[PDB]
Design a protein around this nucleic acid. Structure first.
Lengths: 98, 558, 49, 171, 56
RNA sequence: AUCGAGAGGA
DNA sequence: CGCTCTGCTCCTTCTCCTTCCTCTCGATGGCTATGAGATCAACTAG
DNA sequence: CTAGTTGATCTCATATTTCATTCCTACTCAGGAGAAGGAGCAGAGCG
């Protein structure tokens, strides 16, 4: 066992490295249960971009692309997420900043 | 016989066209086919019409006008003169061939090399032709170098027999009895030839049809005749499926199909290697495989050389051992650590052929690359391989002792590296005169080199295991070294038997270089287990010695 | 083989450009080669490497 | 067999060649490209008729190219053979390898098996001739040929023949 | 060729049919999404010739 | 090079 | 008036479906493979 | 024209009988609209 476990220590190491490097939060098998985009390259265009990236969120629900009441500025968001900082395009209202 | 339509010829004279210069080639091919069918221009020399087949027959009629000893002198159901000429176990062999002929199913015969596999069957064929009044046809298959032999014995003992060579012959089926061909020739002639239904079909190199899936074995199988026989040079060497294929060719209906055999007729746990309900190890697998061996014994013959050839000086199983150098050990560990990409990558230079990388590290770490020319000026370097040092020591000892040494090597790259080493790298070995051989050597040159070795003034004869069959006679050898595990045990037997032909009065010491703790020892263990399986299926001893395959199979990978 | 159309005259013996050199266009900044096949002695008869 | 058939060939014409002399150039180009041509559809193009009265319609400019493509209509004389058909050809040569005859633009061919069984080759005759049977066939004589096959080459059309029967003898 | 049992021949026929079908169209509204060794669905000819960026 | 993913822009 | 038939209605399955441009990061690694032996062709010379 | 020699290519090949196993692990995260196909039913004509 002393070395049989060490054979699969690469399992832990490479699994964590894959999950964080690629963003596919699964086991790296077939994008199974993948949440591609969980981990992103830290933006460093300027200081404000870095700070905003480090304080960002994401709603997987809207990835389906549905057009309905969600991805709107609910008023329970008062004082918890920025009412103005939200991207354009598909992610408007699904990406929110604390 | 040029039957080409003259219409196209006079059209060509009307307007010649050089673009159809391949049409002459097609016509040559068609003429060759028509030769093999019913014609021949200059191929009478290949034991065909114009030879003893239909021309020199009178040379034998005066001594016996179509009435040989099988008919005139001591006439019986069998010949009388040949039997007197025949030796012990040969008359019995022909008698059992006669029994099998009455059985009208087939058979398989073979004795230890040098005991006359080629003989004892020509006599039986002649007996059937004359005493048995067998009109034929009779078929033989073997390599051309052995086809010339078969023809020589045929024309020597039994001139009246009509035998011919299916290499570059003609007429054949167009004329009347016996036909000899090559296995590759058999593949080429997938035409009606397979439908001839050769009454007496006999295959010489049964070892060449061991694999059921091999094209040679299946091609022979399609040619079904009431009496099909195999003269395998050696019995089972790799798997019992080989014996299944042989028996199916000779005795299809007397044994089960491939499944029945593999799931049941398999000495390993398949048949109950622990038939006594003992450890899953294959140590008590008897009364089931032994039953199959006893069932097949009424269909196989075997004479041990010791039976009549007791004049065989001592053999030596001296397994040398080597030490892996620090450079070699470092590269070995590096590969082992980096080998696991898919952990087998379907082999492909990791396990199945990563064994090749390990072997290259063991033997020629200095020139471990396809682009050896970049390192050739400074390499090989024996300092990186202690096996080379051991070889140098043994060769120098045998040179000072004046022993003709045989060296058996792996793929020709290692051969050339060793040649360069001995010739230039070490002046000590340069003083020794040496000889060379490879698979690319010409047949005439191969025979010349063999003759030189048998009476050589040289010291070292570097040889490759695979080249040449059992016919290569190297009785002049006085010492033997095996450079690495030569895979199939049959190859090892052939290599150690290069010196051991009929003769070889001077004792020969056989050595096998080995690296302690390396995968080579594991390969040797696998070969030992293969030999144990061969012994079990051949003699059925109560051998409890059994390497623990249940874990050693995976251990042997690396 | 197929050595790029840019300028190699700006590289050093290390296969790198010394800092302070003015590089423009498709000039080569890192010089790296693959001593790989074809492993043919015919090529040795031709250009050695 | 000789017969007259209609023809319709498409001619492209480079714009630089457009001009008052266009019709003459069209006629020249077609007559040089067609007269004596070999075709498997129509054998040999022997003669183009009504050279004065030629209906060229008149053609169209290619979409992305200024060149003009013309479909010129014709009545033309052509010759083709038929299997089973008898031709009164003129001999050209004789040989033990076979016998061949000329028919206008085509050369008929006769096989060893298509001469009379009694008509063997006499190489000793000068010129070589089929003197075996009562009907002597010489190289410069004339003979009827019984066609049993058409041989097609891109550069020429050929055919086979037979002289077995009496009515197929020398003329 | 070797006179294999009925069920083995049936299985081989089904496997060949499945591979051919996936080759022409690797989306059959069924469970067996044929996929490559690397873990990516095979790009059938239908997939190449279908949809935006789809050869038409 | 390929494919996949993410970021953003009109 | 019971039988049968049939179209008519309704209710589940059962698929199949959304301009253009530019960056960067990374994960694929390649799905066949012994050399020998034997045959064929290609070069060569009389 | 052709027989000889030699380079070149084609097929050979088979595994060796085998450990051995877990099992298969599930959250996030579609649904929307339309065709299709069956299933039931009720009445109308029959016997």
């Amino acid at each position: 066992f002393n070395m049989k476990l060490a054979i699969n220590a690469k399992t832990i190491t490479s699994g964590l490295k894959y999950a964080l490097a690629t963003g596919n939060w699964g086991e790296q098998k077939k994008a199974m249960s993948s949440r591609a985009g969980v981990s992103q390259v830290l933006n460093r265009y300027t200081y404000s971009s870095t700070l905003s990236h480090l304080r960002r969120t994401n709603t997987p629900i809207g990835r389906d692309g549905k057009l309905a009441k969600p991805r709107q500025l609910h008023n329970t968001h008062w004082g918890l997420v920025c009412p103005a900082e939200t991207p354009e395009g598909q992610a408007c209202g699904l990406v929110k900043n604390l | 016989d040029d039957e080409e339509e003259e219409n196209d010829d006079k059209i060509l004279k009307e307007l010649e066209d050089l673009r159809f210069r391949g049409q002459p080639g097609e016509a040559k091919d068609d003429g060759d086919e028509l030769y093999y069918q019913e014609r021949l221009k200059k191929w009478v020399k290949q034991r065909s019409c114009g030879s003893q087949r239909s021309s020199d027959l009178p040379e034998w009629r005066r001594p016996h006008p179509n009435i040989p000893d099988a008919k005139l002198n001591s006439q019986f159901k069998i010949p009388g003169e040949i039997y007197s000429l025949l030796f012990n176990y040969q008359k019995t062999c022909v008698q059992w061939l006669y029994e099998l002929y009455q059985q009208n199913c087939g058979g398989i015969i073979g004795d230890e090399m040098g005991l006359g596999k080629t003989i004892q069957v020509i006599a039986f064929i002649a007996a059937l032709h004359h005493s048995g009044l067998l009109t034929g046809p009779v078929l033989i298959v073997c390599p051309a170098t052995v086809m010339k032999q078969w023809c020589n014995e045929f024309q020597h003992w039994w001139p009246p027999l009509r035998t011919v060579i299916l290499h570059s012959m003609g007429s054949g089926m167009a004329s009347d009895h016996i036909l000899i061909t090559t296995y590759v020739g058999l593949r080429i002639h997938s035409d009606k030839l397979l439908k001839v239904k050769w009454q007496y079909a006999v295959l010489d190199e049964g070892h060449k049809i061991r694999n059921p899936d091999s094209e040679i074995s299946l091609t022979c199988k399609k040619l079904k005749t009431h009496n099909r026989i195999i003269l395998s040079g050696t019995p089972i060497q790799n798997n019992l499926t080989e014996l299944w294929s042989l028996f199916d060719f000779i005795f299809p209906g007397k044994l089960g199909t491939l499944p029945v055999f593999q799931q049941q007729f398999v000495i390993p746990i398949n048949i109950g290697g622990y038939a006594n309900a003992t450890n899953i190890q294959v140590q008590t697998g008897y009364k089931c495989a032994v039953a199959l061996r006893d069932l097949i014994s009424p269909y196989l013959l075997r004479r041990v050389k010791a039976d009549v050839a007791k004049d065989l000086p001592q053999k030596k199983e001296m397994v040398l051992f080597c030490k892996l150098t620090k450079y070699q050990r470092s590269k070995y560990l590096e590969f082992l650590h980096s080998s696991d990409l898919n952990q087998i990558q379907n082999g492909k230079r990791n396990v199945l052929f990563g064994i090749d990388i390990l072997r290259k590290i063991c033997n020629h770490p200095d020139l471990l690359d396809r682009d050896t020319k970049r390192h050739n000026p400074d390499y090989g370097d024996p300092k990186r391989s202690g096996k080379m040092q051991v070889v140098k020591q043994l060769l120098l000892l045998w040179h000072k002792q004046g022993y003709k040494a045989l060296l058996f090597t792996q793929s020709r790259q290692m051969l050339d590296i060793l040649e360069e080493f001995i010739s230039t790298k070490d002046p000590d070995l340069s003083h020794l005169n040496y000889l060379r051989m490879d698979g690319t050597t010409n047949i005439k040159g191969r025979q010349s080199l063999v003759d030189r070795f048998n009476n050589e003034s040289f010291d070292v004869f570097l040889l490759t295991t695979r080249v040449g069959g059992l016919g290569v006679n190297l009785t002049g050898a006085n010492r033997i070294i095996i450079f690495d595990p030569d895979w199939n045990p049959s190859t090892d037997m052939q290599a150690r038997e290069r010196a051991w032909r009929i003769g070889q009065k001077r004792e020969v010491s056989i050595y096998r270089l080995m690296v302690g703790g390396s995968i080579e020892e594991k390969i040797y263990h696998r070969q030992i287990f293969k030999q144990f399986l061969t012994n079990r299926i051949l003699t059925d001893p109560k051998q409890k010695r059994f390497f623990k395959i249940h874990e050693l199979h995976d251990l042997f990978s690396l | 083989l197929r050595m790029k159309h840019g300028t190699y005259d700006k590289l050093d013996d290390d296969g790198l450009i010394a800092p302070g050199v003015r590089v423009s266009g498709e000039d080569v900044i890192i010089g790296k080669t693959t001593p790989i096949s074809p492993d043919e002695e015919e090529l040795g008869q031709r250009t050695a490497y | 067999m000789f017969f007259i058939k209609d023809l319709s060939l498409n001619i492209t014409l480079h714009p630089s060649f457009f001009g008052p002399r266009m019709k003459q150039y069209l006629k020249t180009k077609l007559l040089e490209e067609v007269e004596g041509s070999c075709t498997g559809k129509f054998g040999y193009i022997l003669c183009v008729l009504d050279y004065d009265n030629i209906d060229i319609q008149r053609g169209r400019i290619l979409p992305t190219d200024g060149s003009a493509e013309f479909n010129v209509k014709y009545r033309a004389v052509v010759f083709k053979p038929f299997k089973g058909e008898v031709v009164d050809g003129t001999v050209v040569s004789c040989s033990q390898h076979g016998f061949e005859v000329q028919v206008g633009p085509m050369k008929v061919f006769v096989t060893k098996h298509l001469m009379p069984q009694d008509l063997t080759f006499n190489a000793g005759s000068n010129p070589p001739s089929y003197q075996s049977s009562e009907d002597v066939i010489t190289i410069k004589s004339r003979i009827r040929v019984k066609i049993e096959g058409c041989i097609s080459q891109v550069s020429s059309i050929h055919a086979i023949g037979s002289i077995k029967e009496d009515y197929l003898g020398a003329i | 060729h070797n006179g294999a049992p009925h069920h083995a021949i049936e299985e081989a026929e089904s496997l060949l049919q499945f591979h051919v079908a996936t080759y022409m169209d690797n989306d059959i509204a069924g469970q067996p999404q044929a996929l490559q060794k690397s873990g990516r669905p095979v790009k059938s000819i239908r997939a190449r010739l279908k949809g935006k960026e789809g050869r038409i």
